[PDB]
Amino acid sequence: XXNXXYX
Amino acid sequence: XXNXXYX
Ligand SMILES: *[C@@H]1O[C@H](CO)[C@@H](O)[C@H](O)[C@H]1O[C@H]1C[C@](C)(N)[C@H](O)[C@H](C)O1
Ligand SMILES: *[C@@H]1O[C@H](CO)[C@@H](O)[C@H](O)[C@H]1O[C@H]1C[C@](C)(N)[C@H](O)[C@H](C)O1
Ligand SMILES: [Cl-]
Ligand SMILES: [Cl-]
Ligand SMILES: [Cl-]
Ligand SMILES: [Cl-]
Numbered sequence: 548x549x550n551x552x553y554x
Numbered sequence: 555x556x557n558x559x560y561x
Contacts, residue, residue: 549556
């Protein structure tokens, strides 16, 4: 993970 | 990707 979003 | 670094 480590990313974010939101999709 | 998804991992990091820095090499
Ligand atoms: C992770 O490194 C890339 C280069 O490969 C940069 O372009 C990017 O800004 C950097 O990402 C940030 C944001 C993220 C992905 N949510 C994490 O918090 C990382 C550690 O920092
Ligand atoms: C997403 O990350 C930001 C930056 O650290 C926090 O401010 C935010 O609280 C966080 O979102 C929470 C709530 C969410 C979107 N429902 C998910 O549970 C994420 C993983 O954590
Ligand atoms: Cl994560
Ligand atoms: Cl992070
Ligand atoms: Cl999402
Ligand atoms: Cl690197």
